[PDB]
Amino acid sequence: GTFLFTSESVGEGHPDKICDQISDAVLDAHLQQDPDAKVACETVAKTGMILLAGEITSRAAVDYQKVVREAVKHIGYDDSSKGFDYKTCNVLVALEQQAPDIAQGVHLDRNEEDIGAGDQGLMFGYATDETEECMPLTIVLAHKLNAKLAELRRNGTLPWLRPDSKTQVTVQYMQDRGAVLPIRVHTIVISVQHDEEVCLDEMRDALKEKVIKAVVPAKYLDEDTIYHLQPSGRFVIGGPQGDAGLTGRKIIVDTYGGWGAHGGGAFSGKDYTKVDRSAAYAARWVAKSLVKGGLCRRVLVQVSYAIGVSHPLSISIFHYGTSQKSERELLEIVKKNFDLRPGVIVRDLDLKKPIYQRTAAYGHFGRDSFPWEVPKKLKY
Amino acid sequence: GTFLFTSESVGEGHPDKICDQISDAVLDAHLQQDPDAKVACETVAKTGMILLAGEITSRAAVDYQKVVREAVKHIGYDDSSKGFDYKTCNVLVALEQQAPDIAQGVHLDRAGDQGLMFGYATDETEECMPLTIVLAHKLNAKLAELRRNGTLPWLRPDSKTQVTVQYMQDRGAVLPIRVHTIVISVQHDEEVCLDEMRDALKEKVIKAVVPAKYLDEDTIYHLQPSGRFVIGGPQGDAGLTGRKIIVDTYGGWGAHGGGAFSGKDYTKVDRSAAYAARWVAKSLVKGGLCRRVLVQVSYAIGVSHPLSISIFHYGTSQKSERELLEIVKKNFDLRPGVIVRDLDLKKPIYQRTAAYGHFGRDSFPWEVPKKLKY
Amino acid sequence: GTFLFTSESVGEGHPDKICDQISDAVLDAHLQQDPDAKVACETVAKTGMILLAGEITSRAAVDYQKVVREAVKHIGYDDSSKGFDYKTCNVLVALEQQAPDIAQGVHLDRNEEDIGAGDQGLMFGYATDETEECMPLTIVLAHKLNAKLAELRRNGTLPWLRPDSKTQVTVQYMQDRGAVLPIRVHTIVISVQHDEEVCLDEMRDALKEKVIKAVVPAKYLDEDTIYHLQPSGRFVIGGPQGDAGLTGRKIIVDTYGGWGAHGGGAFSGKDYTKVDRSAAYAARWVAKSLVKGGLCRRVLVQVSYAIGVSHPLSISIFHYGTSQKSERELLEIVKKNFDLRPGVIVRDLDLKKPIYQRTAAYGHFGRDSFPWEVPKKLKY
Amino acid sequence: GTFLFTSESVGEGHPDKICDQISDAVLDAHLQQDPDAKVACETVAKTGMILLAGEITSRAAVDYQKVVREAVKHIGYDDSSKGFDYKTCNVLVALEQQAPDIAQGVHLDRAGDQGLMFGYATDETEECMPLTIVLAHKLNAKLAELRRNGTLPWLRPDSKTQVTVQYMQDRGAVLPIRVHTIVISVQHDEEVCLDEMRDALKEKVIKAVVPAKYLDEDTIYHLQPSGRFVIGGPQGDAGLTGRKIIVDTYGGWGAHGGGAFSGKDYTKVDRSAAYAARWVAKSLVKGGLCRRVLVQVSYAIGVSHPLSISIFHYGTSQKSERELLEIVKKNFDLRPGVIVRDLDLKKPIYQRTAAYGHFGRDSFPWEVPKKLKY
Ligand SMILES: Nc1ncnc2c1ncn2[C@@H]1O[C@H](CO)[C@@H](O)[C@H]1O
Ligand SMILES: Nc1ncnc2c1ncn2[C@@H]1O[C@H](CO)[C@@H](O)[C@H]1O
Ligand SMILES: [K+]
Ligand SMILES: [K+]
Ligand SMILES: [K+]
Ligand SMILES: [K+]
Ligand SMILES: [Mg+2]
Ligand SMILES: [Mg+2]
Ligand SMILES: [Mg+2]
Ligand SMILES: [Mg+2]
């Protein structure tokens, strides 16, 4: 019955993640001035360049140079020696108005609850009782390891740390009547960018003692746990230098780390009419409500939409055999407790609030301060 | 016992898919001249612009003006009236190409990344793929065919489809009963009327693609649901490489452990090993060992052979998951270098993978089952 | 004593001129909302692309996509068949704030009259009594031929005309005690973009009869005047297609067509603190005031500046031998009648007004509606 | 009888001059592999960005990453602290290159543009150039020399200079009396103080460059007149090719009929014929025929020989303007193809022309006088 599972996470300096964070900084800037801004901001990062491309219709007046550069500064790129500098990089902007064909078809002249989905697509929600955050342990640990790196970097506990990082966590699992039971951490891989003025031995020791031991519960670590710390050796240069990144290229990392399923839509740079984000958030909220409500131990939720149509086209519940209720009974409960129109989801989850930059690293799910992470008390 | 499941696909002129096709055209162009080229090509598309970005190690000299413009012409974007024109678009090249290692070039006498790849196969179609995503793909292909042959000359290249199937289950296998809902949105000229479009989409597209047994009086049609789709392509929506990874794979079914395919050469194990894991899954189903199967392959830093393989048959096999694993190990060598030899992955066939799905197609080595010995 | 002289002019669709006009559309957009905007907007045009690059510090909120596209539409590029389309071209924007080192050094915390020159440089003014506009006849005729093409194109008199054009006018001159006397037009070259649906014979006839005869005084045209009309044959595609243009690459065309001298500075995209524009305008005003005042028949004026310094570093007057007064006497007259500080020039010539897009084709000099073309009555 | 005249020059790291040097580096790279390459390369520079745009017909395969980055490194922009770094800048390539004509490539057995070009020469310096622009150039060169040898290591690459000379005239010749005003603005580090900079600029730069006879107690110095120039290069001011055409030529003296030089091959007659007209003017002065001279050469559509040549000697010749014209016609063939052979203009020497002036330099064929027969 046993298996290994591995999830990845990347730090704020990974070029794909730079792009997600910039995209969401641009979104939040619009939303601070215009709660109804329509935003579809894609970011591209490569040697010496950030480019913004997409569609925005907004009453806000946003200084894109400042927003981009300040976000790059926040990430921690302020020098050639690091591979990238917010002060001297190229910032190119190709942002236009949202197509009138789209605007007319989705949101123009409609009451808020009746706003059409901004696009077709499918979205999944997932939850699992194996952690208190109702997330897979592999992806929880991978994200927490990258967050701890950035925390220690920014407060000066390990001042040699730089922004680019990647972590991979392999956990050995047992199964229990469709639930999954994590038993031990099999392997932890951590690669992190660093200043020239530190040796590998010191870094590797710090990674084990100040990062891994601070984050991973001791019960899961044992004599046979494999540690690959700076496995490729030195990593002085990182970020976009000799690399290319794009918004929405870490969607598995952003969600459940390979668990459950994904509908393919990216989250970052998109306002709530883009169901790729708002309905995946709501479906997470549904999944977590079902598990915390004690209706199942593990659950996958699918929803889908058509451009310009307010209501979901389909809703599906898969409980992995972990409920006394049938999947049809759970679906009926979901339909009685949730209204998954984007114009209702927006009110329920407060999705005009400019909190999206916070979502763009360390996973969109599993943190308690977001409204989709507060379970709904269900009536049935 | 019944449930719904939904998958989508997009056309060749969807802006994200334009980028996947260009990224793979770039890969193919390199491989044609240098079979050992290393390519990590990202494409970005917005109004008027094709931007290429990324890292290449290669001996090839590629004419990007030609490669990009021919791809765009082939997709069908050849006039400003359509929103994009291969003749007049801006091709920006930001690719960083270097020569291969000098010392090894003169060495005339001749993978480590912790993660997992998933393969999936189901007997519900002959493609060994979910019906939802098979139909979604074929609906886009049909639109391109009818556009290109002049049957529906009001069609433009950008299209999206979505199919919801009502299924029942039988001992872990999934049995399609009927198509519940079809969405089609396709870019169009300024003369055709909405009634005429909706009729053609049902009668000449959907009914030519979906087996009649799956269509009934209750099937729901959302055809041109936005009302007007004249602006399309990159003009309407920015595109990037690797933003249709679920379209490229299994449509929400099975699992995905991360990574996009297009614009990456065969040494990127998250492409090559995903193709191998598909090959294994399809071999098990076509071999009659499983009706449905998820093949999960983990690789470790410092091991070439997989760290571990798990086979999840959903209860559709008489044999245990452990017995199937033993059959897999005796019949497949999933070291990444062996994969690339067995599936002939140095050949420039990647552009063809970049629309209508990487899986389920009638034309790639990973879609040819291996005859298993056991 | 005789010589030939040739000047060129280009139409609004010439790729360099597209860039000047866009640069000045961006300037005027800023100035409409913020009269004190600092603008240094360079434009680049090539196949399917307009890029803006430079420095702007302004209270205005400017929609660069709309400003660029509307200017391209105004020029007349709205279809692939023409080589360029405002609807579907790429517009990239790389506009940042003016460097604080520059701002502090030039204009910050200073009274308006004491504002420092925005840069060092040298500038020339020129005037000549050979036309009523006080301009060389070669450049007057070259500009007027391109203007007449755009006029007839836009009002539908010759609907096959497209925006790209180039004209070259060779005039035979005599000299008269340092003045120049135009005698005859030696050669007129006109190339103009056109729709596919017209033949060369019809175009050539129209160019002679509706353009050249409407614009060039009959006295200068004779039996030996050489006409090269569509000399390279068909010209269906023009503008940025397979070409590249930049702001400030037509500075000779913009000024005196090869006559007098040039200090090297471009005009378009620059607010009045950039002496490259404001002091060249003032020096034109000085030159024209001297000629119309009857102090000389032909005159060249030089001025120069240092970054951050309000006053000119040098002023020089060269009268070609066409005055009874010495060059030193004329200089003394100029210094008594003009204050060539940029902060004074701005008030005299009304240079915060958003009229700059009008300057960007058909020459900055010679038109009566601009304040630098109204002679100052001189006291001496 | 005295007057002032002012000319300027800029350093290698002035952003417009960066672009001229890159455009000509691109030209040279093409010519090194293909002497018949046609090049019209525009460079744009702004914070973090080198953009190449333009049309090329050539058989060469050029590594733009290398050509651009090496040029920037050579100029001295190698760290973010200086505002620009060759290591980390974005190189965007939008050049459109095509192969030469297929039919003529197989033709194995082997200019029309109405306009004028001006040449100018003056005996006031040995360079045969105005003192104003000679001094302005040399002041920038001195700054680069002292920066590069570590004498003044607080110097950065971006610099501008301007020199105003008080002249008298003698029968049309111009005689420099004294330097009236010097401006120097040069980018600098964050540690050096303004007093120290101003002293070094006067004592180690100006006094090492300007002949002492021209400096006096009344010479006006504007050294670092802005007060602070730490931000510089493309970060501070966008650069473009062909925006220093007066710096490249005669500094306001003589005349200019239009056109920039850099990034254009020898078949662009407004480069080649401008060089020839300089050659003619310098030959007349060095031959003792003129002290000062403006050579005006007109070309006509459909004539290879110039349509007309006028020689304006300002009264500095015993011979009439007509007699000088006859000497020019007997000694020079100004057909553009003959020019390119005589001045050896297919050689890749253009990058060297792109800073410190095209005229007056000790190293180009157009600056070597022709011995005249008359
Ligand atoms: N007016 C429209 N109606 C329906 N779909 C559209 C429209 N415009 C663009 N699309 C499609 O939706 C995607 C996301 O906006 C585009 O890439 C395109 O395929
Ligand atoms: N703070 C400054 N002081 C003086 N000159 C400057 C400053 N910043 C830039 N420059 C120079 O002036 C030019 C135009 O702004 C630049 O290319 C640069 O050479
Ligand atoms: K059990
Ligand atoms: K998009
Ligand atoms: K006379
Ligand atoms: K500039
Ligand atoms: Mg999507
Ligand atoms: Mg997309
Ligand atoms: Mg200037
Ligand atoms: Mg400049």
Structure explained in plain terms:
4 copies of one chain form a homotetramer. Chain A contains 8 helices and 13 strands. Chain A has helices at 15-33, 64-75, 100-106, 137-154, 200-215, 275-292, 327-337, 342-349; strands at residues 3-10, 38-46, 49-57, 78-79, 84-85, 90-96, 121-128, 161-176, 179-194, 226-229, 244-246, 298-305, 314-318. In chain A, the strands form 4 sheets. Chain A has a 4-stranded mixed beta sheet, with helices on one face. In chain A, helix 5 links the parallel strand 9 (179-194) and strand 10. The longest helix of chain A is centred in the N-terminal third of the chain and has 19 residues, at 15-33. The two termini of chain A are 34 Å apart. The interface between A and B is large, with 69 and 72 residues. Bound molecules: adenosine (ADN) (2 copies), potassium ion (K) (4 copies) and magnesium ion (4 copies). One adenosine (ADN) sits between chains B (14-15, 158, 160, 185, 226, 228-229, 232, 236-237) and A (99, 101-102, 105, 119, 307).
Q: Strand-residue fraction of chain A? A: 25-35%
**Share of residues in helices of chain A:** 25-40%
The CATH architecture term of the largest domain in chain A is 2-Layer Sandwich
Quickly name the level 1 CATH class of the largest domain in chain A. Alpha Beta
**Annotated CATH topology of the largest domain in chain A:** GMP Synthetase, Chain A, domain 3
Structural class of chain A: alpha+beta
First CA to last CA of chain A: what distance?
34 Å
Tell me the number of helical segments of chain A per DSSP (H or I, 4 or more residues long).
8
- Gross geometry of chain A: flat
